[PDB]
Amino acid sequence: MEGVYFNIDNGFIEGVVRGYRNGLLSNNQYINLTQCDTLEDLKLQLSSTDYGNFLSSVSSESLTTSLIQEYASSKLYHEFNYIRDQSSGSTRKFMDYITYGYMIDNVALMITGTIHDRDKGEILQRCHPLGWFDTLPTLSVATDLESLYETVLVDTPLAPYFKNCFDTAEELDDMNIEIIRNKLYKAYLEDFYNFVTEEIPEPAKECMQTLLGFEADRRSINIALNSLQSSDIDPDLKSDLLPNIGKLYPLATFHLAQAQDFEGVRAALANVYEYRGFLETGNLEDHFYQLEMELCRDAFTQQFAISTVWAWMKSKEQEVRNITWIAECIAQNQRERINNYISVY
């Protein structure tokens, strides 16, 4: 069974990630964060959690929402780098595959900032330090997508993902880069799905398959809801952006590819059972965040599985997003919508 040969390499990693998991904030702790008046009260209230002595040795007057999200993200990133250093074999590969999806976002961000003639150092910060890949600041030269690819991208692990991206052969603007990036992330999700299907053991295999299914479905609905802006897009030129994985591909990405208005997307999602609860109500992004957190919560019930790393990563990112939203509502005196955090624990 699954508990037999797992611990030999991954028992220490699994125990440490469960110990990280036990420090996730519950509902009462978020309510205590909501009841803070100033920002120093928020610092003192966060000090009595797993975070504590993280804003020690900063200041009492240089405390800012941006500084709090920087340090709360850096703690996450150092913990992930520790767990990635303590692994080998298939787990090391799996965590590198977690890193590549942020590498794609850094590629798109650096190219987009290079188009608008911004500084190298401005784009080098706010550029998500986990997806680094050493030859990243060299993407600020030589605007043409080929003269990026034949020079620096072939030696990166993102090299097998540009097999579709060489159709247009001109200088780039803001819509071409997004078409490129969507093709990247499509090929990426299908590479990582076929990785999980063949090497990861079974109770982690099914959990990672359903989590990747939700990632593909969320990005399919986002591309279908963003592609009906002011352009003309062939359904043949749009169905190369929706991934061939998920519970809405065998036939429901077809009606997303052939859709003109918002009602076409509503009628496309009307037959998939988990969906069509989303478009007839308010903030459409919070439904994806809530369903992702419920799936990640369901991933913590399997014990001998390395789906725990992915589930804890996404849960801790949602936790940082919640603390940033609460800190914004405290610092700007906008307490009307402070209870819109997403807490499942």
């Binding site: 359904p235 043949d236 169905s239 077809f254 052939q258």
Partner: protein, 369 residues
């Protein structure tokens, strides 16, 4: 724009709470308000058959067809249907249509299995032909009061005959019931057909009463609405009995969408040919082969082709129906397309029909064209 049903059995649950088991002494319980003349109209569905020849006189579905006979808001469209039925029930021509659909009112295992796999596949196609036909009468220009429940009745009737085909093919293959009542209880879930009047028949052979939510009385009503009017029976030369049963006949034939020029004689028989003088006139014969092409190339092409034809745009059918599907080849995804290859000869014949009548499309879904 013409029909809106419901399934709320808790809004008017006082009519179904107590154990009302008598057709008599129910009109006082059906009043329930300060309205009297319009509460009798909803009672008129079961009242001529409320005493003569029935078992137990209140079956549990005979109240929901009488409770949801919603005449509370509108009392005009159902009254027009009630002025037309029982005015249609006077000629023998309706009665001889209600006697053709009725009686008087080893290697042998491979053969008997194939006779019932043919039964499960013909009725599985013809059920699907009414599902894409209840969204043609959803288009603007049609109507839904007579068109919807007439063909919702038939799609339930083909779902039961298709179920009896492969339940019988299973119990013959595994040998050489309770499954037919499990599927009969299943097809009564969800929606339910709109209420049409009762169509009572009184003649010298007795006093009969049919139901119009039976698939065999629907199938004989549309055979009556088929043929065109003649030189007699509508002229003022014969004021005898004709103009109240002929103008009632034409006001239903127009209510489907069929003009009185349209003939539409059925086809099914045990003979070789039909006749000589009632043949289709080669403009609709070329057009009926175009509709049969649209039924049997795709499951979704009949509705956007009728929608393209009501706008007078029936020459752009080859381009408004083309879409592309992927194909794994030896060189990758290729994204080829599927188009209805209507020839120019039968693309012209769809123009001379201005709009397909709903009666023509329902003979097509039954295999009568």
């Amino acid at each position: 724009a013409s029909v809106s049903e419901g399934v709320l059995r808790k809004k008017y649950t006082k009519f179904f709470q107590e154990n009302i088991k008598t057709h008599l002494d129910l009109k006082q319980a059906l009043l329930k308000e300060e309205k009297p003349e319009t509460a009798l109209l909803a009672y008129s569905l079961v009242s001529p058959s409320g005493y003569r020849g029935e078992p137990l006189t209140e079956r549990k579905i005979l109240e929901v067809v009488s409770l949801l006979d919603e005449v509370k808001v509108d009392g005009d469209t159902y009254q027009q249907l009630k002025n037309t039925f029982d005015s249609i029930s006077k000629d023998p021509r309706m009665q001889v249509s209600l006697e053709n659909q009725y009686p008087g009112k080893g290697v042998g295992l491979l053969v008997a299995t194939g006779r019932e796999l043919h039964k499960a596949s013909v009725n599985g196609d013809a059920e699907a032909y009414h599902h894409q036909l209840e969204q043609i009468s959803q288009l603007p220009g049609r109507d839904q009061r007579l068109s919807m429940p007439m063909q919702q009745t038939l799609a339930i009737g083909h779902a039961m005959l298709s179920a009896e085909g492969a339940v019988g093919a299973t119990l013959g293959m595994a040998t050489g019931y309770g499954l037919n009542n499990e599927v009969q209880d299943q097809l009564k879930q969800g929606p339910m057909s709109g209420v049409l009047p009762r169509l009572e028949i009184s003649n010298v052979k007795g006093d009969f009463t049919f139901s119009m939510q039976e698939p065999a009385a629907v199938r004989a009503l549309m055979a009556y609405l088929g043929p065109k009017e003649d030189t007699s029976m509508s002229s003022p030369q014969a004021p005898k009995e004709a103009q109240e049963m002929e103008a009632a006949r034409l006001t239903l034939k127009q209510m489907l969408g069929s003009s009185p020029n349209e003939h539409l004689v059925p086809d099914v028989d045990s003979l070789l040919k039909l006749s000589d003088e009632d043949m289709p006139s080669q403009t609709e014969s070329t057009a009926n082969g175009a509709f049969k092409k649209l039924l049997s190339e795709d499951w979704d092409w009949l509705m956007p082709a009728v929608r393209a034809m009501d706008k007078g745009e029936a020459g752009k059918i080859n381009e408004k129906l083309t879409y592309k599907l992927p194909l794994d080849a030896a060189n990758g995804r290729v994204y080829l397309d599927k188009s209805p290859n209507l020839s120019d000869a039968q693309l012209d014949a769809l123009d001379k029909l201005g709009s397909p009548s709903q009666l023509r499309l329902m003979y097509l879904a039954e295999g009568w064209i």
